[PDB]
Amino acid sequence: DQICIGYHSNNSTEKVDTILERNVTVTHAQDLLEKTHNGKLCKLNGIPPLELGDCSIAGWLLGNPECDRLLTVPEWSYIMEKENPRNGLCYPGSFNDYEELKHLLSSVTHFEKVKILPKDRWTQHTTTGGSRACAVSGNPSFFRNMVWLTKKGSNYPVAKGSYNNTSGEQMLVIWGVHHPNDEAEQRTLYQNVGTYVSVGTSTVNKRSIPEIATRPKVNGQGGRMEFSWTILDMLDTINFESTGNLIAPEYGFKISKRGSSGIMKTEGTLENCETKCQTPLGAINTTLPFHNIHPLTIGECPKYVKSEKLVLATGLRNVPGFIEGGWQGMVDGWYGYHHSNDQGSGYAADKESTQKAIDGITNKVNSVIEKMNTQFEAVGKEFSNLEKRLENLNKKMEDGFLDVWTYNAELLVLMENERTLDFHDSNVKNLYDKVRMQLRDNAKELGNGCFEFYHKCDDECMNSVKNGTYDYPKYEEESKLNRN
Amino acid sequence: DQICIGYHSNNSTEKVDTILERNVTVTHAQDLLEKTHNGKLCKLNGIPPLELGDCSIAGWLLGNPECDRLLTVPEWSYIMEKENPRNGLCYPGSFNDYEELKHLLSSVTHFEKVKILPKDRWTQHTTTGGSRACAVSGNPSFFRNMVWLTKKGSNYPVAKGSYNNTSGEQMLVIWGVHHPNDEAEQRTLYQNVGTYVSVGTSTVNKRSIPEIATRPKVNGQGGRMEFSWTILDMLDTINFESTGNLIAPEYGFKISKRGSSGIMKTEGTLENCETKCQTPLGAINTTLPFHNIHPLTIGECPKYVKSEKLVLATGLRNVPQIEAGFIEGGWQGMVDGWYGYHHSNDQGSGYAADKESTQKAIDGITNKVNSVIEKMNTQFEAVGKEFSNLEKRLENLNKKMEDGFLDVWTYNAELLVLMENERTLDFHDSNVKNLYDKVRMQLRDNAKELGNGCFEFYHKCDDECMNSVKNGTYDYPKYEEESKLNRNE
Amino acid sequence: DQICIGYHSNNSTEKVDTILERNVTVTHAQDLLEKTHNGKLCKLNGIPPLELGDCSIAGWLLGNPECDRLLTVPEWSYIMEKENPRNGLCYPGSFNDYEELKHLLSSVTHFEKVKILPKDRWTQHTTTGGSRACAVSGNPSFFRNMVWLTKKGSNYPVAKGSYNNTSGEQMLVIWGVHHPNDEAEQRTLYQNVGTYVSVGTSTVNKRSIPEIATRPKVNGQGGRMEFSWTILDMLDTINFESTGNLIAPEYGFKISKRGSSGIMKTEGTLENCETKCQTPLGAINTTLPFHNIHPLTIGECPKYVKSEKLVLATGLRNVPGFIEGGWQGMVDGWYGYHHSNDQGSGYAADKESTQKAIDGITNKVNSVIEKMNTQFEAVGKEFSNLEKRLENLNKKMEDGFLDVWTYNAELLVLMENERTLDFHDSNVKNLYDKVRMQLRDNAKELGNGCFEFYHKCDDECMNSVKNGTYDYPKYEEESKLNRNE
Numbered sequence A: 001d002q003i004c005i006g007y008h009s010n011n012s013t014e015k016v017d018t019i020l021e022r023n024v025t026v027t028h029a030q031d032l033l034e035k036t037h038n039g040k041l042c043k044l045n046g047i048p049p050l051e052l053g054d055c056s057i058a059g060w061l062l063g064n065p066e067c068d069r070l071l072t073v074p075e076w077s078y079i080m081e082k083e084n085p086r087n088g089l090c091y092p093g094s095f096n097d098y099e100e101l102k103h104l105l106s107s108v109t110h111f112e113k114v115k116i117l118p119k120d121r122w123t124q125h126t127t128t129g130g131s132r133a134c135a136v137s138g139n140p141s142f143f144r145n146m147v148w149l150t151k152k153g154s155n156y157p158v159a160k161g162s163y164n165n166t167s168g169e170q171m172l173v174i175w176g177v178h179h180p181n182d183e184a185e186q187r188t189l190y191q192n193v194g195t196y197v198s199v200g201t202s203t204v205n206k207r208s209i210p211e212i213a214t215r216p217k218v219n220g221q222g223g224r225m226e227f228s229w230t231i232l233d234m235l236d237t238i239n240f241e242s243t244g245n246l247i248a249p250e251y252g253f254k255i256s257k258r259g260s261s262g263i264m265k266t267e268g269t270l271e272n273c274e275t276k277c278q279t280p281l282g283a284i285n286t287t288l289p290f291h292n293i294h295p296l297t298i299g300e301c302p303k304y305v306k307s308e309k310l311v312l313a314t315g316l317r318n319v320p321g322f323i324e325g326g327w328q329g330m331v332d333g334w335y336g337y338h339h340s341n342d343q344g345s346g347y348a349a350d351k352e353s354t355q356k357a358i359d360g361i362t363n364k365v366n367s368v369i370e371k372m373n374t375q376f377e378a379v380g381k382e383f384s385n386l387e388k389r390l391e392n393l394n395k396k397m398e399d400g401f402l403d404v405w406t407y408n409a410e411l412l413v414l415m416e417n418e419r420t421l422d423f424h425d426s427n428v429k430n431l432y433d434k435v436r437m438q439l440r441d442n443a444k445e446l447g448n449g450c451f452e453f454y455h456k457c458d459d460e461c462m463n464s465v466k467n468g469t470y471d472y473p474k475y476e477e478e479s480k481l482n483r484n
Numbered sequence B: 001d002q003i004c005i006g007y008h009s010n011n012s013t014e015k016v017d018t019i020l021e022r023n024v025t026v027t028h029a030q031d032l033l034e035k036t037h038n039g040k041l042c043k044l045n046g047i048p049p050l051e052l053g054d055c056s057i058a059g060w061l062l063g064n065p066e067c068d069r070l071l072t073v074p075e076w077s078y079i080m081e082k083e084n085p086r087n088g089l090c091y092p093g094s095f096n097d098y099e100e101l102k103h104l105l106s107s108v109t110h111f112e113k114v115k116i117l118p119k120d121r122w123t124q125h126t127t128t129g130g131s132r133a134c135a136v137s138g139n140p141s142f143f144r145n146m147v148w149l150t151k152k153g154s155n156y157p158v159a160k161g162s163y164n165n166t167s168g169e170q171m172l173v174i175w176g177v178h179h180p181n182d183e184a185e186q187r188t189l190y191q192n193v194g195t196y197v198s199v200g201t202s203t204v205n206k207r208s209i210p211e212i213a214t215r216p217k218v219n220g221q222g223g224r225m226e227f228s229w230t231i232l233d234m235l236d237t238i239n240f241e242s243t244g245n246l247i248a249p250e251y252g253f254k255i256s257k258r259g260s261s262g263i264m265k266t267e268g269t270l271e272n273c274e275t276k277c278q279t280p281l282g283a284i285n286t287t288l289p290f291h292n293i294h295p296l297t298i299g300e301c302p303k304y305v306k307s308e309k310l311v312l313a314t315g316l317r318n319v320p321q322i323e324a325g326f327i328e329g330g331w332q333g334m335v336d337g338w339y340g341y342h343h344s345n346d347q348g349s350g351y352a353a354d355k356e357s358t359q360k361a362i363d364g365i366t367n368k369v370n371s372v373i374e375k376m377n378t379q380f381e382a383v384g385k386e387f388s389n390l391e392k393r394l395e396n397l398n399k400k401m402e403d404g405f406l407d408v409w410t411y412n413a414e415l416l417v418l419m420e421n422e423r424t425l426d427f428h429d430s431n432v433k434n435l436y437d438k439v440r441m442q443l444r445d446n447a448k449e450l451g452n453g454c455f456e457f458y459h460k461c462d463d464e465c466m467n468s469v470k471n472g473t474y475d476y477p478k479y480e481e482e483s484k485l486n487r488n489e
Numbered sequence C: 001d002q003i004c005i006g007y008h009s010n011n012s013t014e015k016v017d018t019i020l021e022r023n024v025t026v027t028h029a030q031d032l033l034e035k036t037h038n039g040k041l042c043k044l045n046g047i048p049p050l051e052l053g054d055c056s057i058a059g060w061l062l063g064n065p066e067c068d069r070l071l072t073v074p075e076w077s078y079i080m081e082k083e084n085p086r087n088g089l090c091y092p093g094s095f096n097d098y099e100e101l102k103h104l105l106s107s108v109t110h111f112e113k114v115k116i117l118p119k120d121r122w123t124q125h126t127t128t129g130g131s132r133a134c135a136v137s138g139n140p141s142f143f144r145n146m147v148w149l150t151k152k153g154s155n156y157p158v159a160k161g162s163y164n165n166t167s168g169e170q171m172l173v174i175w176g177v178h179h180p181n182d183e184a185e186q187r188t189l190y191q192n193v194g195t196y197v198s199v200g201t202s203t204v205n206k207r208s209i210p211e212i213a214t215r216p217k218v219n220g221q222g223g224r225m226e227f228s229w230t231i232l233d234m235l236d237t238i239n240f241e242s243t244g245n246l247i248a249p250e251y252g253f254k255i256s257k258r259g260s261s262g263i264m265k266t267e268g269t270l271e272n273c274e275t276k277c278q279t280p281l282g283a284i285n286t287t288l289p290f291h292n293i294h295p296l297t298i299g300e301c302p303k304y305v306k307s308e309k310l311v312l313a314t315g316l317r318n319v320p321g322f323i324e325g326g327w328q329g330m331v332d333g334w335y336g337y338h339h340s341n342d343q344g345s346g347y348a349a350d351k352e353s354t355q356k357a358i359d360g361i362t363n364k365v366n367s368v369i370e371k372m373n374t375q376f377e378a379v380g381k382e383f384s385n386l387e388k389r390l391e392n393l394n395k396k397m398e399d400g401f402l403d404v405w406t407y408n409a410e411l412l413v414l415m416e417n418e419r420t421l422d423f424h425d426s427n428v429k430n431l432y433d434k435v436r437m438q439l440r441d442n443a444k445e446l447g448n449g450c451f452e453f454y455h456k457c458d459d460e461c462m463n464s465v466k467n468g469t470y471d472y473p474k475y476e477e478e479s480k481l482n483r484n485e
């Protein structure tokens, strides 16, 4: 009668890492990292994104003539913008607090255009101005959402306009000022000198004086246009007054939906899919809790780790008694209790320690996945030319948190793998020690892992041993008899 | 003649958590987290806070007529403010660099009001102006700490004012400019167009022009007042000069105490205590090194971890015998030590507890606890800050930084406690096994092990011999022949 | 006839720390922290730094009369500046976006002065203006890189000037405006009131109005000067137009080399070295992976840990069979097989488990060094008086990352030391257990960590025992006969 204790072995070829060892073969391994994407920019939960194409956000909002397909826009999930869009400010100029506006838009879904100041009310001015820098079929044109006020005859009466926000939600209004390149152009466009533009609401209050200087010709013109914006609250009023150099708005952008969104800097084109989260390189379809594609993602999907391998060893060592190696024969459990009697042999497994080990390993896996749900998520942000210190601060903070969490994940995986391998070895050793303890001195220890019984006993005796019910006082006299 | 080795079990029901097992019962556990507070706003080391109430900081410094109880305030320890104070700028307007002023005030204790420009020196102008927006008992009034200069008769001569800071410390000066809502109002109040307000110090150079615009009515007025500030260095001079639209200061605020304080956003009222540190929800009076009430605290008290439970296992496992050794469970009789060494002689018995291993294990566990506590004293402490409407990027940056550091440190603390529990339980098991192995080793082969954790001596010894075996002075050559003779039977 | 099992002991006096016990004596230890510097400021890879002395960046760029030794400056590796420089803006005033310019300079090597607007083209104005705030040898002087245009005779014609950047790289241009203290001074200097200064590029549009006010006297003057700057792109032109209060530039600064550099706030001078890594306190010359001198560093050299000692335990516990302690007479390896045959004895050491332990320890050391090479590196930054919140944010972020990484390193070292000591003890115990298992009952376990054979066998048999080729059916009969006695 022999009762050898061992561990199940198989033919898997999965390798894991450890603190003391590298490239170790195990039986069962669970991967936690996804490294594949389909390389397609496409829908999020059935709502298509907004594709600006060769357009900028400023060009979309001001109404660039080239960007005429964005005049009416349905609900969206995210915004796709090129890194250096070509169609931006048709007329050269600047946008004040552009990056703050982009940050505000990042969490704003569907807009709704409202005609707040029609073009027919300006009866004492000319509203048909345009420039060749914004040309359609060769003829001069202008922004679609704004009006350029100019002389009518030879006078420029004081321009007044007001809007009381009775729409129902918050509204965004954009206005501008014009800066000519000489006094002659100012006199030929507005018939006044020392003009002003005044805007006033319940919170904001500006009065801007046009600035005239000689400048290089950008897009053919030496003049510039300065654009500002504000957010108008419910039941609030905005007032406009100008003796000259006013670019009045015609539409305000009501905020309609709101939600979680973002702006993506991609060079791709919209295709037809349906994914759950989207990265600037492609979509992700996964159930694993980590990925290594791109830090900036939109939707609900795994955390980002800057690593190439994250494999958790949930099985045993693959080395083909337990002092020589594993057993290929066993298929039931994890720990070996070889059967060999006179009437027959067998390969029965142990149902006691196996369940405990499975529960412990599953608890460890779940704890590892659970400890990392509080990771750091990066959010896109834009910074101007004179804000390089802030940009460096943001970049360094994001990189530092990413490195910290990558280190944490890798160290946890390594330590858990080492603990798992040692845990299995200790479990097998403890089972062998318990068998030797219970059986006591009524056997000889062969050395390879099992005992040669000193007393002849049968199926009932040794399944009693397996159940931990061997009774030393029950059968020892014949053992001592055959001891001689 | 029979010795045994086991461990100690008791009646405790504290539960601890481990990286592999959940809700494991132990003998002794030490708590580290604190989850209670009195829910009262009260004193810090005997110094009461500055309770603004319904007033804002601008309303306190400018002298809003509703904030007349704060004209002279004593030394404070922190400032209590509401999220949306009702009484701020009674006359509508703005306040340039408000948040920088609040950041400066977060580290400034007791002020001292000094009359730098008396109201009576303006003998060529009118100083009795006021608005119904800041009205007391129906009649018009104005800010208590400022002067509104208007024309006297039909003339507004150039107004000049200087102050040389000989007060002995740094001074805070606040001025303003009035923006009317048409040209007629400007001519009715100052009798001039194209006016200016100029302020000049050694490091400050400004010249503001009025901005006339059509605006809605806030608190009944269409005009606005813009306020600015500066910090005057010692032995420095500040100059004022204006053709119109000047809201001149009358008092200057002198920094006197300095120290560590803060601005707390709360909606409660002051009460009677004496606390060591204060949170916006209450106060903590304990000695544990962790808490989970609110990230922003003023004073000296534990660090913040976003966890619900943090218990360290400083004891054995609790699996007592159902209905005599470590293979079955623990013994209730060991009240002297941690590692039991039950003995039983021919004439008597007992439950003596070992000493050499117990003291070493106690020292090790205490060192581990102290190391865990000491490794986490370099945590991240959150500091309150305020941001404007056009600074959302900066606010998001600050919020993300604080939240990320809190998450990192919470993860560190939780993982450390888990690993400590695992290794402590394994340590105790290994130490019991080591003691048993040492006893078996010294015993050599002069006993038959019963299996249940202990062996019955083949040689018949007495109290002295078995005490020597306990101490570790068992001599094989002295008592081997009789043992062999007995085992021959 | 008897063998024994043990480990190696010697007379080293290195102490390591562990999570369960402090100041443990070990045989072999490795240090990972550098705590020494030469206290000198000196060259980085053969290129000397730029020594500003008692001058600020603004003083160097605007041409202060005191900083006359920096008119021509060769290539550099880093910039030396004092906390409170003496010679800065000789004429009192301000510098717009000073910290952004310093950040731009933080990654810019060699400049090249280009004379863009000569001093002789202003044939309708007086260019010889000067002040006693910047005085050389008593007489009034001015900035060397700037021109002060005043009236000539009794007229101030409109002043125009343009430059087209054909130099071949980006060029930095600085201009200024003047603020007098009274209307009389403005009339004396320029003959016009309500003057303007206008600057225009393809991305910059500005119109500045002089601000006249009464101010205290700084450096003996009540006026102020405000300076601004811009970066000119290639093939882009800049236009200047003013009716007064214009401080025109004469030189532009072409960015010629670019690279990695920095600004270091120090008070020392330049000595002679050839270092690879420089700190504001001194230079570092080491191959260890960590240091604790100063967070700010220029060059390539170890990471910063805010700690006092970091020692990794490589060897065994140094206490002088394996139960009573280690052996002092073993020199070959770590785990030994002290044997004593009938005709002799010895102190042989095993060569199979020793290699495994050596490989494991080396892998652990290399791994510990490898995981900690993605640390956080601090970069110097400057903030103004009204940017206190940003400064506090930056300081708190840098400090927090420093503490996080210090904690990580310390915990790693402590846990690894515990694991190493336990690993060595377990390995020795495993060796003894495997020998005892292979010997089967043909042994009399003495207790002291080793036993006496029950069968008399020679050197070859003992070698076979040590090599794992011990044969039970070879010499068991005589052993049983002996044990029956």
Ligand SMILES: CC(=O)N[C@H]1[C@H]([C@H](O)[C@H](O)CO)O[C@@](O[C@@H]2[C@@H](O)[C@H](O)O[C@H](CO)[C@@H]2O)(C(=O)O)C[C@@H]1O
Residues within 6 Å of the ligand: B129, B130, B131, B132, B133, B140, B150, B185, B189, B220, B221, B222, B223
């Ligand atoms: C010197 C002074 O304070 N004068 C007025 C003041 C200003 O004339 C102006 O309103 C600045 O905001 O305003 C006060 O007076 C007025 C009301 O009583 C009146 O019904 O409506 C006026 C506007 O049309 C004006 O508001 C005020 O602010 O209430 C007070 C004072 O007389």
Ligand SMILES: CC(=O)N[C@H]1[C@H]([C@H](O)[C@H](O)CO)O[C@@](O[C@@H]2[C@@H](O)[C@H](O)O[C@H](CO)[C@@H]2O)(C(=O)O)C[C@@H]1O
Residues within 6 Å of the ligand: C129, C130, C131, C132, C133, C140, C150, C185, C189, C221, C222, C223
């Ligand atoms: C063209 C020029 O530089 N002219 C003066 C200059 C200006 O007149 C003005 O001071 C701008 O700051 O200032 C200098 O002259 C003067 C002193 O020598 C005199 O004692 O006091 C003057 C003021 O009351 C004035 O400061 C100067 O800055 O020293 C030089 C030059 O003559």
Ligand SMILES: *[C@@H]1O[C@H](CO)[C@@H](O[C@@H]2O[C@H](CO)[C@@H](O)[C@H](O)[C@H]2NC(C)=O)[C@H](O)[C@H]1NC(C)=O
Residues within 6 Å of the ligand: A164, A165, A166, A235, A236, A237, B216, B217
């Ligand atoms: C903007 O419109 C709203 C409503 O259309 C105005 O609010 C009303 O004001 C009148 C004053 O004559 C009150 O009688 C109403 O009760 C108000 N309605 C609500 C819903 O509050 C508001 O006054 C207008 N804004 C301005 C500047 O006149």
Ligand SMILES: *[C@@H]1O[C@H](CO)[C@@H](O[C@@H]2O[C@H](CO)[C@@H](O)[C@H](O)[C@H]2NC(C)=O)[C@H](O)[C@H]1NC(C)=O
Residues within 6 Å of the ligand: B164, B165, B166, B235, B236, B237, C216
């Ligand atoms: C502000 O007052 C201080 C003294 O209270 C002035 O400093 C003195 O200036 C005179 C110049 O005539 C010197 O003789 C004294 O030695 C100075 N005393 C001290 C203590 O420094 C200071 O000049 C005044 N400020 C202004 C702008 O005049």
Ligand SMILES: *[C@@H]1O[C@H](CO)[C@@H](O[C@@H]2O[C@H](CO)[C@@H](O)[C@H](O)[C@H]2NC(C)=O)[C@H](O)[C@H]1NC(C)=O
Residues within 6 Å of the ligand: A216, C164, C165, C166, C235, C236, C237
């Ligand atoms: C600045 O100088 C460059 C180089 O001479 C000018 O670029 C040239 O412009 C002319 C237009 O008449 C073209 O024919 C050349 O081919 C251009 N040269 C290059 C290398 O592109 C540039 O126009 C000048 N700037 C201004 C404002 O005139």
Ligand SMILES: CC(=O)N[C@H]1[C@H]([C@H](O)[C@H](O)CO)O[C@@](O)(C(=O)O)C[C@@H]1O
Residues within 6 Å of the ligand: A129, A130, A131, A132, A133, A140, A150, A185, A189, A221, A223
């Ligand atoms: C009211 C208006 O738009 N007027 C004219 C403008 C301006 O006069 C300036 O040139 C500013 O661009 O410019 C054009 O001549 C041009 O060729 O761009 C078109 C147009 O006739």
Ligand SMILES: *[C@@H]1O[C@H](CO)[C@@H](O)[C@H](O)[C@H]1NC(C)=O
Residues within 6 Å of the ligand: A021, A022, A023
């Ligand atoms: C496995 O990792 C070890 C590192 O110890 C390396 O030497 C070996 O080449 C690796 N093998 C493969 C197939 O990558």
Ligand SMILES: *[C@@H]1O[C@H](CO)[C@@H](O)[C@H](O)[C@H]1NC(C)=O
Residues within 6 Å of the ligand: A274, A275, A285, A286
């Ligand atoms: C995502 O992968 C699963 C595979 O489990 C597949 O069934 C599913 O169709 C995939 N999703 C899409 C949108 O193709």
Ligand SMILES: *[C@@H]1O[C@H](CO)[C@@H](O)[C@H](O)[C@H]1NC(C)=O
Residues within 6 Å of the ligand: B011, B012
């Ligand atoms: C457990 O036993 C102790 C004996 O000291 C006793 O004080 C305590 O009240 C008991 N606890 C319970 C819940 O019975």
Ligand SMILES: *[C@@H]1O[C@H](CO)[C@@H](O)[C@H](O)[C@H]1NC(C)=O
Residues within 6 Å of the ligand: B022, B023
């Ligand atoms: C203890 O933790 C276990 C987790 O395995 C949980 O199932 C059980 O409900 C917990 N008990 C209590 C009283 O919370």
Ligand SMILES: *[C@@H]1O[C@H](CO)[C@@H](O)[C@H](O)[C@H]1NC(C)=O
Residues within 6 Å of the ligand: B274, B275, B285, B286
């Ligand atoms: C703090 O609590 C302790 C109880 O441990 C109490 O003795 C002490 O008086 C309390 N301190 C205050 C200020 O209430």
Ligand SMILES: *[C@@H]1O[C@H](CO)[C@@H](O)[C@H](O)[C@H]1NC(C)=O
Residues within 6 Å of the ligand: C022, C023
């Ligand atoms: C070693 O460390 C211990 C801390 O447990 C301390 O008590 C002892 O003084 C230290 N010895 C030396 C020589 O530093």
Ligand SMILES: *[C@@H]1O[C@H](CO)[C@@H](O)[C@H](O)[C@H]1NC(C)=O
Residues within 6 Å of the ligand: C274, C275, C285, C286
């Ligand atoms: C740095 O130290 C090494 C010692 O290994 C020495 O050889 C080398 O010359 C030193 N470098 C300098 C610049 O002194």
